[PDB]
Design an enzyme around this catalytic site. Structure first.
Site, short mmCIF file in Angstrom:
data_model
loop_
_atom_site.label_atom_id
_atom_site.label_comp_id
_atom_site.label_asym_id
_atom_site.label_seq_id
_atom_site.Cartn_x
_atom_site.Cartn_y
_atom_site.Cartn_z
N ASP A 31 44.75 35.33 43.03
CA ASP A 31 45.09 33.70 42.77
C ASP A 31 46.59 33.77 43.19
OD1 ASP A 31 46.49 31.61 41.51
OD2 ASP A 31 45.29 31.62 39.72
N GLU A 123 50.71 38.31 31.27
CA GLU A 123 49.73 37.10 31.75
C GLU A 123 48.70 36.96 31.12
OE1 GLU A 123 47.87 34.69 32.58
OE2 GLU A 123 46.94 35.72 34.24
N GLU A 132 40.54 33.36 24.76
CA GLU A 132 40.73 34.56 24.56
C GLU A 132 41.54 35.15 23.53
OE1 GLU A 132 40.83 36.60 28.52
OE2 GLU A 132 40.67 34.99 29.42
N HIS A 280 42.96 30.06 39.68
CA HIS A 280 41.59 30.61 39.12
C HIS A 280 41.49 29.82 37.53
CE1 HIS A 280 44.04 33.24 36.81
NE2 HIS A 280 43.18 33.55 35.93
C1 LIG Z 1 43.80 36.17 30.11
C2 LIG Z 1 44.01 36.26 31.74
N1 LIG Z 1 45.44 36.09 32.06
C3 LIG Z 1 43.27 35.15 32.32
O1 LIG Z 1 43.61 34.72 33.54
N2 LIG Z 1 42.26 34.87 31.87
C4 LIG Z 1 40.98 34.06 32.61
C5 LIG Z 1 40.09 34.64 33.52
C6 LIG Z 1 40.16 36.25 33.77
C7 LIG Z 1 39.53 37.09 34.59
C8 LIG Z 1 38.71 36.52 35.67
C9 LIG Z 1 38.75 35.16 35.48
N3 LIG Z 1 38.07 34.46 36.51
N4 LIG Z 1 38.48 34.15 37.79
C10 LIG Z 1 37.31 33.57 38.58
C11 LIG Z 1 37.63 33.06 40.03
F1 LIG Z 1 36.37 32.87 40.60
F2 LIG Z 1 37.99 31.59 39.91
F3 LIG Z 1 38.45 33.64 40.52
C12 LIG Z 1 36.29 33.58 37.80
C13 LIG Z 1 36.64 34.07 36.59
C14 LIG Z 1 35.74 34.34 35.53
N5 LIG Z 1 34.35 34.46 35.69
N6 LIG Z 1 33.79 34.76 34.43
C15 LIG Z 1 34.99 34.23 33.39
C16 LIG Z 1 34.95 34.27 32.07
C17 LIG Z 1 33.76 33.57 31.32
C18 LIG Z 1 33.46 33.35 29.96
C19 LIG Z 1 34.54 33.70 29.14
C20 LIG Z 1 35.64 34.10 29.66
N7 LIG Z 1 37.04 34.42 28.85
C21 LIG Z 1 37.64 35.21 29.90
C22 LIG Z 1 37.25 35.08 31.34
C23 LIG Z 1 36.10 34.37 31.07
O2 LIG Z 1 35.84 34.08 34.15
C24 LIG Z 1 39.35 34.27 34.66
N1 LIG Z 2 45.19 43.35 22.68
C1 LIG Z 2 45.01 43.74 23.98
N2 LIG Z 2 45.62 45.21 24.24
C2 LIG Z 2 45.93 45.67 25.52
N3 LIG Z 2 45.27 45.10 26.58
C3 LIG Z 2 44.75 43.84 26.30
C4 LIG Z 2 44.46 43.12 25.37
N4 LIG Z 2 44.04 41.84 25.16
C5 LIG Z 2 43.74 41.77 26.84
N5 LIG Z 2 44.32 43.13 27.35
C6 LIG Z 2 44.35 43.17 28.74
O1 LIG Z 2 45.21 42.35 29.50
C7 LIG Z 2 44.62 41.76 30.56
C8 LIG Z 2 44.69 40.31 30.60
S1 LIG Z 2 44.52 39.68 32.69
C9 LIG Z 2 46.26 40.25 33.33
C10 LIG Z 2 46.16 41.41 34.05
C11 LIG Z 2 47.24 41.87 34.89
N6 LIG Z 2 48.47 41.87 33.75
C12 LIG Z 2 47.79 40.67 35.72
O2 LIG Z 2 48.69 39.76 35.52
O3 LIG Z 2 47.02 40.77 36.98
C13 LIG Z 2 43.22 42.56 30.94
O4 LIG Z 2 43.43 43.85 31.78
C14 LIG Z 2 42.70 42.80 29.69
O5 LIG Z 2 41.82 44.04 29.43
#
Ligand SMILES: C[C@H](N)C(=O)NCc1cccc(N2NC(C(F)(F)F)=C/C2=C2\NN=C(c3cccc4[nH]ccc34)O2)c1
Ligand SMILES: Nc1ncnc2c1ncn2[C@@H]1O[C@H](CSCC[C@H](N)C(=O)O)[C@@H](O)[C@H]1O
Ligand SMILES: C[C@H](N)C(=O)NCc1cccc(N2NC(C(F)(F)F)=C/C2=C2\NN=C(c3cccc4[nH]ccc34)O2)c1
Ligand SMILES: Nc1ncnc2c1ncn2[C@@H]1O[C@H](CSCC[C@H](N)C(=O)O)[C@@H](O)[C@H]1O
Ligand SMILES: [Cl-]
Ligand SMILES: [Cl-]
Lengths: 342, 342
Positions: A31, A123, A132, A280
């Site tokens: 992203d 993030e 989440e 994303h």
């Molecule tokens: C916390 C972190 N900073 C963050 O960005 N959270 C959201 C998050 C984390 C990791 C991956 C994604 N995703 N990106 C995409 C793409 F295709 F668009 F690229 C699909 C996707 C899914 N696929 N499946 C899920 C999904 C489905 C149901 C509950 C969920 N809870 C978190 C992700 C998730 O996301 C979204």
């Molecule tokens: N309580 C917690 N302690 C440690 N890691 C956690 C957490 N809750 C979520 N995470 C982690 O935090 C991340 C969220 S996504 C962000 C990933 C990375 N910092 C980036 O910006 O690309 C994931 O790797 C997830 O497993």
């Protein structure tokens, strides 16, 4: 601890397994708006990192810590609870940064840091910002923050606004109405129709859309990460009074969020608004089963209530009425189980 | 408890929660070949149901029990472990069949039936036939089957066949090469490229494909539900010798399955083969870590070994060699985390 408290294992295990996949870390890294804005926020506030100690909450691949490193941080504690932590350690070594980035496996609620930090980066944002429940972990981490330490991001805004979009409403309604069939292979399903409609409309809809479907200026709810406490996010009550700019059926509320990094040199913004290039996170819409009819000029008022649950998500309550007619609409949405329309 | 012994609690909560969604029941019901064939198998063997006692293992919406009712069954016990059981009860009421269909909430391993049954019906088949391990539940249910009672379905065949599909193979690397770059926002990611490769190869691919990718006649492994025991599915060893009908690079094995309802009046087949119209099961492919070259005429031999685990799925082990050259390959896959390519 605080984490185990608010989280069922059937959730916290499935959750961290998900972030153990390289392809899901890739989804975030790829992203470009997200990753590129973080790097710029960090490099352009280099004085906030130069020779400082930083904590990266949930480092994932470690990408944000490398940014902190690029910007001169002296020491970075990179906390990660999933197995991705091991891959991050590999990258730290292969990038020759073992003297500055320290990976620490485990939940930020449960590990120990050798020292207090000048700044936390993270993030943690989910769909609709709050999904989440990782914002609580980010806020929790403040127990390691030195007095007058900084938070990157510093604040977050959730926006909501009423929308009309009947192609969506009907696509979901038609899905439900499978359960209206009086003679499916000779069997009458119709008694479940109501149950069906409820189930489908409980799913928030994640994808993007043309801004033209918005029917009034967004209402803003702000979290100040420098000031908020974990518990502020257990029950989030967002009152709204929209002043309708167009007449038409209101089919629900659309949500998106911005965060700001308020650095010493400049403030930088990361937006997931529908007027901005796609991220994303896309955007999120909570439909009403029964749309509200509004005329330009009416005010649409009510409350969006977000109640945190033990599945690291929220039960969403939306009540809205057209003040001029008294037409009410009440809804309950389950943020754990989104519909990815895209 | 036979069920809880073999199943991690977390896995079962997520599993039965999934089947509590009407939309997931709908996914199965909407599969016209599946649902239509079940109805026909039952109605056309009406003498197997007329005035009989039947057990429906995992009745879901109840749909199969209504087919047994349409065929004259006197009493049908419909067992269902998810909350879908409540909706099924509503349907039985609204369809005025409370005198004939009795919904029993709970796991077929844990409930009681007031009597033995003449015939068990179920639709327990997962991806690759065996996924979900529900066939064990179906087999377990035989403790309620009268001597010489019948099973619908009566037998199941799994087919596997070698395929060549150069694009699907290379796609795995194209994706993993995301990580093969020396300065991604200033970070060398390449150290993880292997990991990303291994990750993609552990996932079985679910989608369909043209029958021309197949390089030999399928090999068949059969389960006779009238005879098999639960334990026969804990460790499934499927030996194979393929005689290659075409020269080329074998990239993996493809799987699909048929089941047969052997009734008193006629035997009816449900096939998910790639030569047949698509079903919600599609087909499943497991790639070889490295392809094997074969000449038409050569033989490709080895073992597909399926080892059940406590996540209600299987660890897949595949070893293969081209006998004439001694070239060999192996892969290990998690059937619990499929890649949905379609
Ligand atoms: C916390 C972190 N900073 C963050 O960005 N959270 C959201 C998050 C984390 C990791 C991956 C994604 N995703 N990106 C995409 C793409 F295709 F668009 F690229 C699909 C996707 C899914 N696929 N499946 C899920 C999904 C489905 C149901 C509950 C969920 N809870 C978190 C992700 C998730 O996301 C979204
Ligand atoms: N309580 C917690 N302690 C440690 N890691 C956690 C957490 N809750 C979520 N995470 C982690 O935090 C991340 C969220 S996504 C962000 C990933 C990375 N910092 C980036 O910006 O690309 C994931 O790797 C997830 O497993
Ligand atoms: C046992 C029963 N007889 C049976 O048919 N089992 C398989 C089954 C059961 C219920 C729904 C489905 N699905 N149908 C479809 C559709 F879009 F194509 F319609 C997608 C789908 C998913 N979506 N997600 C899954 C899924 C993903 C990962 C592990 C899983 N284990 C079971 C389903 C499943 O299937 C498949
Ligand atoms: N051990 C078990 N005991 C009872 N039901 C089970 C079970 N394992 C799985 N099930 C149920 O079996 C169903 C499989 S899908 C089949 C649903 C319906 N019979 C149809 O043919 O459309 C799901 O509803 C699932 O929750
Ligand atoms: Cl998740
Ligand atoms: Cl599941």
């Amino acid at each position: 601890s605080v984490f185990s408290e608010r989280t069922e294992e059937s959730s916290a295990v499935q959750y961290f397994q998900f972030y153990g996949y390289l392809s899901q870390q890739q989804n975030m890294m790829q992203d470009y708006v997200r990753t590129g804005t973080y790097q710029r926020a960090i490099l352009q506030n280099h004085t906030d990192f130069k020779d400082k100690i930083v904590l990266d909450v949930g480092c994932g691949s470690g990408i944000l810590s490398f940014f902190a490193a690029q910007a001169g941080a002296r020491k970075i504690y990179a906390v990660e609870a999933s197995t991705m932590a091991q891959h991050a350690e590999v990258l730290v070594k292969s990038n020759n940064l073992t003297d500055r980035i320290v990976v620490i496996p485990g939940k930020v609620e449960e590990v120990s840091l050798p020292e207090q930090v000048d700044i936390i980066i993270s993030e943690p944002m989910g769909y609709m910002l709050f999904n989440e429940r990782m914002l609580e972990s980010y806020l929790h981490a403040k127990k390691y923050l030195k007095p007058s330490g900084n938070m990157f991001p510093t604040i977050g805004d959730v926006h909501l606004a009423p929308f009309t979009d009947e192609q969506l409403y009907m696509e979901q309604f038609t899905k439900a109405n499978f359960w209206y069939q009086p003679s499916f292979h000779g069997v009458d399903l119709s008694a479940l129709r109501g149950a069906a409609v409820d189930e489908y409309f409980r799913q928030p809809v994640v994808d993007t859309f043309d801004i033209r479907i918005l029917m009034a200026k967004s209402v803003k709810y702000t979290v100040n990460f420098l000031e908020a406490k974990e518990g502020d996010l257990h029950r989030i009550e967002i009152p709204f009074k929209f002043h309708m700019l167009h007449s038409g059926l209101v089919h629900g509320l659309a949500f998106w969020f911005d965060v700001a990094f308020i650095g010493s040199i400049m403030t930088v913004w990361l937006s997931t608004a529908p007027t901005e290039p796609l991220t994303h996170w896309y955007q999120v819409r909570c439909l009403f089963q029964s749309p509200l009819f509004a005329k330009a000029g009416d005010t649409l008022s009510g409350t969006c209530l977000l109640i945190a649950n033990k599945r690291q998500s929220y039960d969403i309550s939306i009540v809205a009425q057209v003040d001029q007619t008294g037409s009410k609409s009440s809804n309950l949405l389950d943020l754990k189980n989104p519909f990815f329309r895209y």
